[PDB]
Design a protein around this nucleic acid. Structure first.
Ligand SMILES: C[C@@H](c1ccccc1)N1CN(c2ncc(Cl)c3ccncc23)n2ccc(=O)c(O)c2C1=O
Ligand SMILES: [Mg+2]
Ligand SMILES: [Mg+2]
Ligand code: NA
Ligand code: NA
Length: 349
DNA sequence: CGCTAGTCGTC
DNA sequence: ACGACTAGCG
């Protein structure tokens, strides 16, 4: 998530009820719901005991969207981007560290502090997501596992017009150019909608309301694909882009210290890391479910060599991507764990 | 004083 | 991993 973006653009937000989307399609960042579901049964999942509480939690939200006449499309995270492989294994280590600390606290009589530790010791596996997929498909709810980050797939579904809004706790969806994003939605259907159109209402932005300029601001402030330079937040990133009057973002970043009157010599790796973050937001691979084809989020522009963009997701045969998308092919082991076929029975029709 | 980043507390 | 919120910094 972009740190503190919701507050900076608070004027573009409005409180809504999901009733607003009766008769409309809405995609969900379902790993947000699986994580909260797995918190409610953290003590059992950590010890390896069998539990399907996280399934009922996601279904509580799905059935609520269906009650108000919304067609939900549950989107799941797929493979890890090459650049994020070192961080996800580091996260597995920190979860296994809290597994032993939670156990130690249960011995010391501190049951409530141990119950809190277990909530930060759970790995959301593709097996857990497949249980949710099977429960959602019984109720006739379409599910789509993204090839890589669900953030990019959700952005595709909205940009294509397949879905009119995205339900998520991640503000990166706005940096990805989503038209309507619904944050902080509770089990009853109440949440905050941020419309890209209403970014004009934000006096803090100035002219940093276009997709390209708004994306650059989020990257400069500190994004998932790149930490910011020290002392740069949304306010200072926003300031740099308003003052600069040059389309080449690279020349603006080299002269960043001049615009802010700050002592910042930008390193070699920050310029390239900015280009990679910008390329991941534009060209990260997604699955077109109607045509059943793996494609970049946006069609390649100007001189952008697709052979240099492996960090934004590697290509695989469309048949492999279809099997990942239907939840049949396990993300980690690439083993077929199911035989679902949409043609032998809709998002894929 | 505006802002950014480090500490306490929780889904 | 999320945000409240606060201190301390430029
Ligand atoms: C795979 C998916 C995912 C994994 C498990 C549970 C919840 C979410 N992630 C991973 N990651 C995470 N986001 C949120 C939470 Cl609460 C996480 C908890 C544990 N481990 C990773 C998390 N993350 C970070 C920054 C992002 O910009 C982002 O898009 C994701 C993201 O979607
Ligand atoms: Mg994500
Ligand atoms: Mg993200
Ligand atoms: Na920052
Ligand atoms: Na300008």
């Amino acid at each position: 998530g972009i740190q503190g973006l919701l507050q900076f653009i608070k004027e573009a937000s409005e409180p809504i009820h999901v009733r607003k989307y009766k008769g409309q399609v809405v995609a969900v960042d379902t790993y947000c719901w699986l994580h909260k579901g797995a918190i409610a049964c953290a003590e059992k999942l950590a010890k390896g005991e069998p539990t399907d509480r996280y399934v009922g939690f996601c279904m509580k939200f799905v059935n609520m969207l269906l009650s108000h006449g919304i067609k939900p499309i549950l989107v799941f995270d797929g493979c890890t981007l090459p650049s994020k492989k070192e961080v996800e294994r580091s996260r597995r280590e920190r979860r296994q560290a809290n597994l032993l600390k939670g156990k130690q606290l249960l011995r010391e009589g501190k049951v409530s502090e141990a119950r809190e530790c277990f909530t930060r010791s759970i790995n959301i596996t593709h097996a857990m997501a497949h249980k949710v997929i099977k429960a959602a498909r019984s109720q006739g709810v379409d599910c789509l596992v993204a090839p890589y980050e669900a953030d990019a797939q959700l952005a595709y579904l909205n940009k294509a017009g397949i879905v009119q809004a995205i339900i998520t706790e991640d503000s990166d969806l706005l940096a990805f150019g989503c038209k309507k994003v619904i944050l902080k939605m509770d089990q009853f259907g109440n949440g905050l909608e941020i419309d890209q159109a209403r970014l004009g209402m934000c006096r803090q932005l100035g002219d940093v309301f276009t997709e390209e300029k708004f994306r650059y601001m989020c990257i400069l402030s500190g994004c998932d694909y790149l930490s910011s330079l020290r002392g740069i937040g949304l306010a200072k990133a926003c300031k740099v882009l308003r003052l600069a009057n040059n389309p080449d973002i690279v020349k603006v970043i080299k002269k960043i210290g001049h615009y802010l009157k700050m002592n910042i010599t930008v390193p070699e790796d920050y310029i390239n890391g900015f280009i990679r973050a910008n390329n991941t937001f534009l060209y990260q691979l997604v699955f077109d479910p109607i045509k059943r084809k793996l494609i970049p989020l946006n069609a390649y522009e100007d001189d952008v060599d697709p052979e240099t963009l492996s960090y934004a997701g590697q290509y695989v045969d469309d048949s492999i991507a279809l099997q990942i998308a239907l939840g049949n092919k396990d993300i980690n082991t690439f083993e077929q764990i199911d035989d679902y076929n949409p043609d032998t029975a809709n998002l894929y029709f």
